[PDB]
Structure formats: C-alpha cells, structure tokens
C-alpha cells in the first residue's frame, strides 16, 4: 500500500491502530541536463507534473507556430515592395540579386 | 491590550507569533490546540433487544372445553383444541372421552440482556462545538485551555481574555438517526420506532427499557398439541434484530475522515482539524516594555547555511552580525516559509549565530524578522530526503524562472517585430505621393 504523508489507519488483530506519514521519497533531480530536468518536471510531482507538461508543451507549440505564420506574413509583405522592378529598370542594392 | 487573529484549524501543531507595539518591546505567543469537542444536541428515542416467550398452563379436562381470551401480551395467541386425548405417565389419559379441552394460551415478553444490553436509538440535533488549546505565550509556559467555538465566548486565563472563532468550517460527520451498542456506534437510517418491523430490527419495539410497550410482532402462531403430548407447539419470529447482530457493519468512528475520532457521552467529535478560527485574546499591556531601552540591532547579515526540503525543520542557517549591546531579542517568522525551529533567541554582542527551519522549497529567496529588524537570507537549493511545510509554490528553482522568461520574451519580441513590419513598409508608400 501507499499513501501521502497524511498517514493512514491500520490494525490487524488486537494490534491498536497506527498511522504513519509516507515520505522519504523524492524521486527526482531538480537540475541536470534539460532531458534530466524534463524527467524531473515529470517526477517532482507524479501527475501535476504530467498535466503541466502536456498543457505547457501544447501552448508553447501553438505560440511558436503562430509566431511562424506571422513571420511568413511579414516576409511576403516585405516581398511586396520590389514589384516596382517589373518596370525592369535601375537597381537599388538590396539582398536579392539581379546584377 | 487585546490582539485578535484568525487561526487555521491546527489540532496538533503549535502556533507562535510575536506581537509588538510602537515604543514597546514585542512579545511572542504559543497557541496549540489540545481538544476539539463537537457536541450535538442529541437524544435517544427508543430501545430494542431480544424478546422472550412464555406459556401458561394449557387447559385440560375429561370433556368439554374452556375458552381462549385476550391474555394481554405482545403477539399472544390462544386456541381451543378438541378431542385432545393426551396421556400422562402412570395416568388415565385425563379423560373418559373426547377431552376437547386445550387452549394452548401463549405469552411473549422481553429478554434479560435488555437490562445489560439493548438498542440505543437516537435523534441527533444541532448542538455545539468546543475545543481545548494550550497557550505558551510571551513569558508564559504551558497553559492548556478549553472553550466553546462561539465567536462570543469571553474567557480570561491569567491575562488572556480568550474570544474564540467561531470556526470557518461548519460541519461534522454525524446524522440525526444514529444508533449504538457497546463502544461501537452506527447510523441506523431510521430505527422504525412505532412501526413493528416484523421484529426484523424492531425485535423489541419499546420506548425505553422500562417502557413496557412492545409494538413489535414475533408473529407468534400456535400449532395443535397432539400425539397425547401436553405441549404448545407453535411458531414465531426469530430475533431479527439479533439476526442483524450477525450483520453488524463498520462503526462510523472507524469511518470518520480527517483521521479524527468521537467521544461517547456527548458525541464529541475529536479533532478533525479543518477550517480557520477567528480568535481574540487580551494580553497584559503591562507585560510590554519600552522600545528605546532595548539592546539595539545593527550590522545585519545572515548566512544561508543549508536546508533540505523535509518534514522536520531540516534546514540550518546562521547570521553574521555586530550588536549595539548584548542581550536577547525575538526572531519572529512573519514568512514561515522555512518553518523556523526558533522564534526568539538571545542576542549577544555581535550575535552571529544560527537557527533551523523546514521549507518544502527546492530553494526560496525569502526573508523574515529578527529583533524588530527583518533581515534577508534567501534560502539555498535544497535536497529531498506528520507535519506541514511551505509547499504552495515556493519550491521554485533556477530553470523554472529561466525558461519561463526565455519563452515569454522570445514570443513577445518576435511578434512585436512582426507587427512593426506592416506600417514600416506602409509609411514610404504613403510618402510616394
């Protein structure tokens, strides 16, 4: 059996009931490698770690991908200027090339 | 002087707090619950226990019959019996012909364990709550004190005008209809008091032991005496409540959550430590002193030696300091994060010494007070390996505040540049004309 440090009742036979906190079980290193700290933020709590992990990975991925789309938006917007050049005339020394 | 507070329900754990005043030297306390006593306004309703069944002398003649009456007993029966023809040893069969005379009059009554042992069937009403504490304040030692929950109770011990709560939480696991044998005790959904439950549980359907009102039915039915045998063959119900006394279950005390128990006579629930208590206590303002006469603080610094997050105050740290002059001065923990073993220490000249404390933290960065001078000792990283901790979120570590700001700043900055881009382009397009 297992329990929190909350103790728990028990008595088989004329044995009086006793109740003992369950602890001395950390089971995790707060800081190792990032993979180590990952196993930690997996184990430092059994489950609250896990729910935090799933929700956090979800939200960070969605934030990053939103940033990515906004990046692409801005990039094509930056593309839009040079459509002057379709005139096929003098160059204005930018990153893209037509020497 | 009176100071009040709201203390959380801490049945076992103590509670110190330094109390100060401008121009006055401070003083600590130490409150510690001793009992919690939850007394409903209950009562018993009726009792039940094993029955008994006796038989008077069944009538007999040579011929003819006597008559069966309403011999007043619970479930009592009687019936004539004709042509009985029963013999007696070395007799003459008690007749010369058809006897016809046998009433088999019956009787039901109560057992004798009833005296020693019977049901205890109760209606349990609102009632009260109270509790015992121990105060070891200031200069005061163990002063264990008991009082009722009500937020009114004016109680003075020494100089402590106690006013208690009442408790935030407002419930104990009880029930109006709860019964009990022996030490055990059971919520009987309802003891069917007036209603004879076929004797299935209301085997003794009576208000009291001495209340000889048996509104119960053993369903006593007689059978015909026969075979020349003088007897009263019959049937009735087995002691049903006893039949359950085979099917007894888990007493509520054994099921009571919050690892707490019950008292027999008042149904005093015993120390289910839940809630907070707005207490109010007067203190001796004479027990105060001045503030200027005191050996003064100076040269503040504390060394965070080490703590490992464990139950016991498993962390030691020291101070390095120089005093105005030697003496003593309290060290209160306004932030009880690292739950200090200490609450008041002597302050010798250059009081540069240590203390002990537990926090659940992997590491804090916090501080607390000493000698009316709050000093900062952040709290180093803590190893892992009954009682509380700090435990809320103070277990913060380096990588946490590192990566959180990492990701937040990265996302913010990139999206900011992204939004900038648009108007950055548009401005010169406007400039075109």
Swiss-Prot record, chain B:
Transmembrane intervals: 410-430
Cystines in this chain: 49-114, 62-94, 63-96, 68-78, 260-272, 302-377, 307-381
Cytoplasmic compartment residues: 431-433
Residue ranges, annotated region (E1 fusion peptide loop): 84-101
Localization in the cell: Virion membrane; Host cell membrane
Extracellular side: 1-409
Post-translational modification note: N-glycosylated.
Binding partners and assembly: The precursor of protein E3/E2 and E1 form a heterodimer shortly after synthesis. Processing of the precursor of protein E3/E2 into E2 and E3 results in a heterodimer of the spike glycoproteins E2 and E1. Spike at virion surface are constituted of three E2-E1 heterodimers. After target cell attachment and endocytosis, E1 change conformation to form homotrimers. E2-E1 heterodimers interact with host VLDLR or LRP8/APOER2 to mediate viral entry. Interacts with 6K protein.
Function in brief: Class II viral fusion protein. Fusion activity is inactive as long as E1 is bound to E2 in mature virion. After virus attachment to target cell via host VLDLR or LRP8/APOER2 and endocytosis, acidification of the endosome induces dissociation of E1/E2 heterodimer and concomitant trimerization of the E1 subunits. This E1 trimer is fusion active, and promotes release of viral nucleocapsid in cytoplasm after endosome and viral membrane fusion. Efficient fusion requires the presence of cholesterol and sphingolipid in the target membrane.
Protein name in the entry: Spike glycoprotein E1
Native organism: Eastern equine encephalitis virus (EEEV)
Shown stretch of the complete protein: 799 to 1239 of 1239
